[PDB]
């Protein structure tokens, strides 16, 4: 059984959950109690020594890092459910690799701090830092300027097909759109339409429920 350790409301778990649904896979979501600090105790640290969710146990295999887990799932269950990494087109598969790396090294480092300040900082007892928000909204805008041009050429980031590249953007963007920083998406027409597209896929709509209130 694919056993996913995490929480429905977290961006990092949701990234895997939507991938699991795209692939039409059975799985078990095992709750990890972040409130009680379960992720920092010896049992979970043995799954992920960095003490963050999610982790995956599949028989004797144990994985962590959300995008390692999605990549594993996408590769292992080739030909089942949606074709996320393009297993029968080399050119397409390569482009997916490009834009998943763009998400990791360009999109995520800019959007993560925005969501952290709005959603996580209050949990740590701090008001959102407007300076950190504004700086990264500027940075994300510049990434999104490139996205706007790309998405004017192709339906999705890696080409005229939905892929793992787009998928990885769903969770942090979902929370961004709940904040005033939603403006960076809404003011770029191709990015906005792209977001409205991928965020309305059945495989994410089921996951979106768990990310709400």
Ligand X SMILES: N[C@@H](CCC(=O)N[C@@H](CS)C(=O)NCC(=O)O)C(=O)O
Say if residues 182 and 195 touch (Cβ distance below 8 Å): no
User: Sign of torsion, CA 171 174 178 179?
Assistant: positive
Say if residues 131 and 170 touch (Cβ distance below 8 Å): no
Residue 198's nearest CA partner among 169, 178, 177 is 169
Q: Which of 49, 79, 125, 202 binds a copy of itself (CB under 8 A)?
A: 49
Q: Is residue 130 part of an annotated ligand binding site?
A: no
Residue 103 or 201: the one with the smaller Cβ distance to a copy of itself is 103
Q: Structure tokens of 158?
A: 């890696």
Per-residue mark of binding to ligand X, 62-91 (x: CB under 6 A): ---xxx------------------------
The owner of tokens 């965020």 is 199
Which partner, ligand X, a copy of itself, none, binds residue 39 by CB below 5 to 8 Å per kind?
A: ligand X
Find the farthest-apart pair of alpha carbons in the chain and give their distance in angstroms, rounded: 49
Residue 105 or 124: the one with the smaller Cβ distance to a copy of itself is 105
Which partner, ligand X, a copy of itself, none, binds residue 61 by CB below 5 to 8 Å per kind?
A: a copy of itself
Q: Up-side HSE of residue 167: CA atoms within 13 Å toward CB?
A: 32
Q: Which of 38, 57, 65, 197 binds a copy of itself (CB under 8 A)?
A: 65
Q: Structure tokens of 132?
A: 């950190």
Which stretch, 61-69, 76-84, 130-138, 161-169, contacts ligand X (CB under 6 A)?
Answer: 61-69
Q: If binding means CB under 8 A, how many residues of this protein chain bind a copy of itself? A: 31
Where do contacts with ligand X occur on this chain (CB under 6 A)? 10-12, 34, 39, 52-53, 65-67, 105
């Amino acid at each position: 059984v694919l056993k996913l350790y995490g929480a429905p409301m977290s961006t990092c778990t949701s990234r895997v959950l939507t991938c699991l649904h795209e692939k039409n896979l059975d799985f078990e979501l095992v709750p990890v109690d972040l409130f009680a600090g379960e992720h920092k105790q010896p049992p979970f640290l043995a799954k992920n020594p960095f003490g963050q969710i999610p982790a995956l146990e599949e028989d004797d295999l144990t994985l962590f890092e959300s995008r390692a887990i999605t990549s594993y799932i996408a590769e292992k269950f080739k030909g089942t459910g949606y074709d996320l990494i393009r297993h029968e087109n080399l050119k397409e598969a390569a482009s997916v690799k490009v834009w998943t790396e763009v998400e990791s090294h360009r999109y995520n480092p800019a959007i993560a701090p925005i969501v952290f300040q709005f959603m996580v900082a209050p949990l740590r007892g701090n008001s959102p830092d407007q300076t950190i928000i504004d700086d990264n909204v500027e940075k994300l805008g510049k990434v999104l300027d490139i996205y706007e041009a790309k998405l004017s050429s192709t339906k999705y980031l890696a080409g005229d097909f939905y892929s793992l590249a787009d998928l990885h953007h769903l969770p942090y963007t979902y929370y961004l759109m709940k904040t005033p920083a939603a403006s960076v998406v809404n003011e770029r027409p191709h990015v906005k339409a792209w977001w409205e597209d991928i965020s309305s896929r059945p495989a994410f709509k089921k996951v979106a429920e768990g990310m709400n209130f």
